[PDB]
Amino acid sequence: NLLLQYGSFCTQLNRALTGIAVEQDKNTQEVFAQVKQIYKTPPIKDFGG
Amino acid sequence: KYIGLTVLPPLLTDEMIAQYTSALLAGTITSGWTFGAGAALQIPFAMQMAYRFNGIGVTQNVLYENQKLIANQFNSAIGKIQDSLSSTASALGKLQDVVNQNAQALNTLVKQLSSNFGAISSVLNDILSRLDPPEAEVQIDRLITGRLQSLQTYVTQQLIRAAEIRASANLAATKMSECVLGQSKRVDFCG
Amino acid sequence: ENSVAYSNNSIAIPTNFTISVTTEILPVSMTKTSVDCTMYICGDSTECSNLLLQYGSFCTQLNRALTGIAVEQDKNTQEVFAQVKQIYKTPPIKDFGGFNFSQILPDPSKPSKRSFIEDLLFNKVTKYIGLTVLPPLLTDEMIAQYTSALLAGTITSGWTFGAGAALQIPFAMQMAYRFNGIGVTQNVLYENQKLIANQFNSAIGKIQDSLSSTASALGKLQDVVNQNAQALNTLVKQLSSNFGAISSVLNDILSRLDPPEAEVQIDRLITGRLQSLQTYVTQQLIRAAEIRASANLAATKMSECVLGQSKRVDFCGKGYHLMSFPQSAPHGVVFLHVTYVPAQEKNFTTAPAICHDGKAHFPREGVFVSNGTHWFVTQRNFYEPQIITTDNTFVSGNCDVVIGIVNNTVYDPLQ
Amino acid sequence: KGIYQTSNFRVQPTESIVRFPNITNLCPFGEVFNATRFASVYAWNRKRISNCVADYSVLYNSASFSTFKCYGVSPTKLNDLCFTNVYADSFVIRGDEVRQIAPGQTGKIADYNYKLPDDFTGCVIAWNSNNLDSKGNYNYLYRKPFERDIYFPLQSYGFQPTNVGYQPYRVVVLSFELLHAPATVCGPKKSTNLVKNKCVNFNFNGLTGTGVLTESNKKFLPFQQFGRDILDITDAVRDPQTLEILDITPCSFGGVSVITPGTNTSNQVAVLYQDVNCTEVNVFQTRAGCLIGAEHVNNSYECDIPIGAGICASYQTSQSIIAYTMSLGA
Amino acid sequence: AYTNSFTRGVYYPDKVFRSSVLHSTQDLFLPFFSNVTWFHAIHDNPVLPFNDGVYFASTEKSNIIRGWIFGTTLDSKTQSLLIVNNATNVVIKVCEFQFCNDPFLGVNCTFEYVSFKNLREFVFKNIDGYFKIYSKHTPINLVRDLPQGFSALEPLVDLPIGINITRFQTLLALHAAYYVGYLQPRTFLLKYNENGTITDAVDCALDPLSETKCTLKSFTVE
C-alpha cells in the first residue's frame, strides 16, 4: 500500500525483465534455429577420412 | 535467492539446442553450404573440401594429391581440441564470464535486501512487528525507496548487459550464417 | 527430420530455381521526443522551478541526452538513405527486360510520391505537459525521393552508382552480372529470362498480398512505435502518482500550502518525477542504441545489398543473393531482397577427378557428374551437363595419385 | 555554425478568472463556536456544513483561541479554497489532553475514542473555557478513526473555577472533505466574469490552473463536474455560473532555437519558435514552427544548417541568413 | 429462488467525464454472473441483511414497489433511513422511527430530501457514513429474468446520514416481484465510449481471461 504511491515503476520493471527474458529465446532461436529441417547422418561414416 | 527472484526455463532445452547443432552439423558435413541456401543437396566430403580450397584460391588438385595427409592433419587438429578443452578452463572464459556476471548481479541484488538504506532494520516483517503505521511508514518509505533504486540499478545493468549479449548473439548468428552455412571471404573473421 | 542421402559416390544438383523476393523489415529511426523537463517536473510553477535548481545539472543533461538522441535520428536516417550524392530517376519508358517495377517505383497519382508497396507500409504501421515531438529533418516525402534514387540507380546502373559515377547498363545484363556473383554461368539467365521476370513479378504480387492480408508483417516496426508510445504513456501517467506527497496536482498543493510546508511536499514530487524522468531517458538511451545498431545494420544492407551484391550467405535474406530494393516505412526501412533459391534436385553419381591419357584431369568450373551412362562437367548451383574436354579441364598427376578417380575419355578440341 | 536550443517560451496568462457557484449563504460556524453547551468527548458531537460561503478571517484573527493548527491546508490560504463538505466535530476535555488531537497521535483521548485518520486534512481549534464550563461540572466525560461507542469504560471530569491546563478546554475540529466532486463550501472570494478563447489564469470551484478556455462540443451528463483527456488529466470543466461545458488547453509553448552561421563568419542570427503559429509570437511559417529573421528563398541548396521537415538554412548574399527547402543533390 | 446477474449492476464510479478511454477502478460492485435472490412481493416478504452495500431491482408496469427501509435494529433506538415514492416525488427521511407490524404505503428526525414492460435498477452503498443512491430505468419484455446485456446506473443522491446500516426491506402500495444482490470490492475495467457513456465492463476476478483484460487494460486480448 506504500509502493502503490510510486505508480508504474514495478509494472515497467516487470515489463523490462520480460523484454530481456523473451529476447533470450529470440537470441537462442536466431543463433541455432537457422535450419528448417533436423538433418541427420547415415549409419556409415564414409567422409573420405 | 528465493525472495521473489526466479529463473524461467529457456524455450529451447539443452537437448533441443543439441539437436539443432546436430542438424547444422549433419547438414554442414553431408551437404556443405547448400542447406542454408535452399533444399539441402548431398555432396561427398572429399568434394566439399575441394570447394573450400577453390574458395581460398588453392587449386582443387592440391586436395586430392594430399587427401590422406589433409585428413590425418584434420583428425590431429580435432584431436588437439579435446586436449585443449581438457586442460584449458580459461578457453571457456567467455561463457564462464557471462555466467559469473549474472550470478554476481543477483548476489549483489540479494545483498541489497539486507542493507538498511537509513531505515531502522532491513528485516521488513520485524519493523512491521515493532511499529504502528504513523511511525512505520517513515521507515518503510526508505526500504521501499532503496529497494526500488536497487531494482532500477539491477534492471539497468541487465538491459545494458542484454545489449552486449544481443550484439554477441547477432555476431554468433552471423558466424553461423557465413562460416557454417557457407564459406567466408572475410579475412581474419573465421580463424 | 531428414536422413540426408549421403554416400562417398553421390551428389544432388538442382535442375531449376525460384527467384524468391523476400522481405526484411528494419527500424532505422524512432520518434524525436524533446521533453521540457522543467515544465514536466514543475509545469507553470516558479515555486517548484526554484527547487529544481537545487538538484544541479540534471535538467540540463536530460535536455542534452534527449537532444543527443533526437539529433542522431536524422544521422541514422541520413546514413541509411543518403548513400547517394545525386538523385537519380528512371526514364518514362520501363524497358527492363520483362521485370515489372511499377509497384516499387513512385506512383505520380499521390501527393507524396511513394510507391504502391510503400502505400501498404504507410497504412499497416499506425500528452501535452512539456513533452513535444520534433520533426524528422527529411520529410517522409524526401525519404521517398531518396529510396527512388537508390532504386533508380539500382534498376538502371547496378552497383556502379555506389562505386563512383553511375554507369547505365541494360537490366537483363545487370542480372547477368548478378548470376555471375552466385557462380551461375549467365547463359542460364537468357535461356530462361521470361521465367525469371515472371517469378520476380509473381513474388512482387505475393509481397502486396502479404502486406495487405497480414498486420504482423510490420510487427518489428509497430513494436518500436509501441515501445516509444508506451514509454510516453508510462512517463505521463507518473505525473499523477503521489510519491508520498499530500497530492499529485502541483498547483493544488501550492494553493493549499504555505512555503515551509510546501517545500517538503514538493521535494517528493520532484524527487519522484525526476527519478521517473531519468528512468525514461535511460530507457530511451538504451532503446536508441538498439535502434542505432539496427540503423548501422540497415545502412550496411543498403551498402552491401542494394549498392552491391553481398557474398555473405543468408545476410541478404534466406538464399543465394541477387539484389535488393529499398522501400521506406514509417520510422524504418524494408528491403525486398531478391534471392536465387535452387528448387528441384536430381541425384547423380559423381567422382572427384577423372583419369584419361594416364594423367588425371580436374574441371576448371564446378564438378564432374554422371547420370550413370555418361560423364559430364557441370557448374555448382545449377544442372547443365557438358561432355568433358581439355578446354573445360586441367591436368595433374596420374590415376594412382588420387582416391575416387574414375577411368573415362576426356575429349580433345584439337582432333 | 549550427542551430542551438537556447530557451523554451510560454504564452503568458493575460488575467485571472475565478468562477465559483452563485451561492450566497454565510455558513453556520458562528452556531458551533457560540453554542451554549458542548458535548462530552466519549460521545463527541458532529455537524455538517454545506451549500454556504466561509470567511475564515473572522475565526483566524479572533483572540478567543489557544490553537489553530491545520494538517493538510494552511490557515492563511483557507479563503482561497473550496471543498465538498467541512464536518465540524464538537466536544470538551482537560487542557492537558488537547495535544493528543493530531493526525497520528496516541493517548487516553486520541487512541481510545476521538482518533483522527492518518491522512486527516483539517484544522483543530481549541481554547480554555474555565469562565464558562466550570461549576464542579461532573457532566463532562471521557472514555479507531472517527469511531463511535455507547469499572465501565466511562470516566468523568469534575471542573471547578479554581482550576492552566487543569481547566476545561472547549475544542472544535473542522475536517475538510477535499474530494473532487460537487463543491458546496467555498471561501469568500468573489467570482469574476468569464473570458473565452484567450490565455487566462483560472480557478473553477477550487480546481486551479492556467490555460485557454474554449466552448466545447462535448456531450454532458448532469452529475459531471469536470472531464478528462485520453491520459489522466483535466480536459474540460462544467461552468458553475450556468451549466455550459468548457475545454481547458495549456497556454501555447515551444522550444526557441537560434540558427547561426559561426561568429567568425558573422554576428547575424535567425530564431525558430518550434511547434507554434507565428500569430502567437522577414518572417516565415514552417512545419517545424514559426521562423523569424531568416529570409525565405525559392532556390534549393545542400542543407547547411538543418531546421526540420525539409527546411534548412545557410548564410548568403547584401548578406543575410536564408532558409529554404533542401535539395537532396544534383 | 435465484437468477444469474450476468452483466448487471455497473454504475458510474465517480462524478467525472471520460470518453474513448478504458479506465480501471476498485469500488464496491455486484460481481459479474453472481446469484441474485429473487423475491415474490405478493403472498408478504422478509427483511434482508445489507452487508457492504446492496443492488436492488424490480420489473414493472403498474408500479407496486414504492420505497425502502434501511437501518440496524429498526426499533426507534437506532436511527433509520426511509425512502418513499408518492407518485409525484421521491421523498426521503431519516428518523428514530418505530415500525409497523409489516410496513406498507396506503394507496426525532434528522434529515429530509424531496425530488412487465419496465426494468428499474437501484444501487445503495454507505461510505464512511455518507450514503449514495444510483439508478436506471429501461424498457424490457423479459418477464422472468434479468437481461443478459449492458446498461449503466447514473447517480441520483448523496445522503450525509452519518448512520450505520446492517438491515433493509422494500415498501409496497397495499390498498409483483423484485431482485436483491450484494456488492463486493472487486476491481473493474470500464469502457467510456465516444460519447462519454460507460458501455462495457470487466470484473477483474471473474476468470483468468478477465484478469488478463485488466492486466493489459484492453477489452481485446491477442
C219 to chain A nearest CA, in Å?
Answer: 14
Q: Which residues contact B2 (CB under 8 A, 6 or more apart)?
A: none
Distances (CA, A) of C73 to C70, C80, C326, D2: 5, 11, 19, 17
CB-based contact (8 Å) between D182 and chain E? yes
C298-314 as b/e: b if 16+ CB within 10 A: bbebbebbbbbbbbbbb
DSSP-based three-state secondary structure for D151: coil
Distances (CA, A) of C324 to B11, C101, C155: 34, 12, 10
Q: Please report the resolution in angstroms.
A: 3.5
Distances (CA, A) of C154 to B94, C324, C325, D317, E47: 42, 8, 8, 39, 86
Least CA distance to B44: which residue of chain C? Answer: C8
Taking an 8 Å cut-off on Cβ atoms, the answer to whether A23 and B166 are in contact is yes
Number of CB pairs < 8 Å for A and B? 99
Type and span of the H or E element at C133:
strand C131-133
Rg (CA), chain A: 23
Question: Which chain C positions have a beta carbon within 8 Å of B172's beta carbon?
Answer: none
**Contact between residue E178 and residue E170 where contact means Cβ atoms under 8 Å apart:** yes
CB count within 10 Å of CB C65 equals 19
Task: Note the CATH architecture for domain E2-222.
Answer: Sandwich (2.60)
Taking an 8 Å cut-off on Cβ atoms, the answer to whether A40 and C4 are in contact is yes
DSSP-based three-state secondary structure for E84: strand
Estimate the crossing angle of helix C193-213 against helix C116-124, to 10 degrees: 20
* Torsions phi, psi for D178 (to 5 deg): -75, 40
Taking an 8 Å cut-off on Cβ atoms, the answer to whether C257 and D5 are in contact is no
Q: Which residues pair with E16 in a beta bridge?
A: D226
Taking an 8 Å cut-off on Cβ atoms, the answer to whether C1 and A37 are in contact is yes
> Of D117, D86, D290, D41, which Cα lies nearest the Cα of D184?
D86
- What nine digits make up the cell of C246? 499530500
DSSP-based three-state secondary structure for B153: helix
Sheet containing strand D82-83, strands side by side: D52-53, D185-186, D82-83
Distance (Å, whole) CA E139 – CA E93? 29
Q: Classify burial at B56, counting beta carbons within 10 Å of its beta carbon; exposed 0-12, middle 13-18, buried 19 or more.
A: exposed
DSSP-based three-state secondary structure for D159: strand
> Of D210, D189, D227, which Cα lies nearest the Cα of D20?
D189
The four Cα atoms C57, C63, C65, C66 give a dihedral, to 10 degrees, of 160
Distance (Å, whole) CA B86 – CA C89? 62
**Contact between residue E136 and residue E147 where contact means Cβ atoms under 8 Å apart:** no
**Contact between residue D52 and residue D23 where contact means Cβ atoms under 8 Å apart:** yes
- What nine digits make up the cell of D286? 514552417
Distances (CA, A) of C171 to C94, C155, C304, C341: 10, 7, 19, 20
Residue in this structure with the C-alpha cell 564432374, named with its chain if needed: C368
D205 to chain E nearest CA, in Å?
Answer: 14
Residue in this structure with the C-alpha cell 462535448, named with its chain if needed: D218
Number of CB pairs < 8 Å for B and C? 122
Distance (Å, whole) CA A9 – CA A21? 18
Distance (Å, whole) CA E217 – CA E24? 8
Taking an 8 Å cut-off on Cβ atoms, the answer to whether B39 and C345 are in contact is yes
**Contact between residue C146 and residue C87 where contact means Cβ atoms under 8 Å apart:** yes
56-95 of C, contacting B, C-beta below 8 A: none
CA angle at residue B55 from B49 to B61, to 5 degrees? 55
Q: What is the DSSP string of C272-326?
A: HHHHHHHHHHHHHHHHHHHHHHHHHHHHHHIIIIISS---STTTSSSSEEEEEEE
Least CA distance to C314: which residue of chain A? Answer: A34
Distance (Å, whole) CA C362 – CA B58? 13
- Under an 8 Å CB criterion, which residues of D touch C? 5, 8, 10, 72-74, 76-77, 80-81, 121, 178, 203, 207-210, 230-233, 250, 253-255, 274-275, 287-288, 303, 306, 308-310, 326, 328-330
E116 to chain D nearest CA, in Å?
Answer: 28
CB-based contact (8 Å) between C238 and chain A? yes
Q: What is the DSSP string of D163-223?
A: --TTSEEEEEEE-----SS---EE-SPPPPP---SSEEEEEETTEEEEEEEEE------TT
Taking an 8 Å cut-off on Cβ atoms, the answer to whether E14 and D181 are in contact is yes
CB-based contact (8 Å) between C411 and chain B? no
Distances (CA, A) of D137 to D44, D141, D164: 17, 10, 17
Type and span of the H or E element at C213:
helix C193-213
- What nine digits make up the cell of C90? 528512371
Distance (Å, whole) CA D312 – CA D306? 4
Taking an 8 Å cut-off on Cβ atoms, the answer to whether D255 and C257 are in contact is no
> Of D153, D150, D155, D92, which Cα lies nearest the Cα of D126?
D92
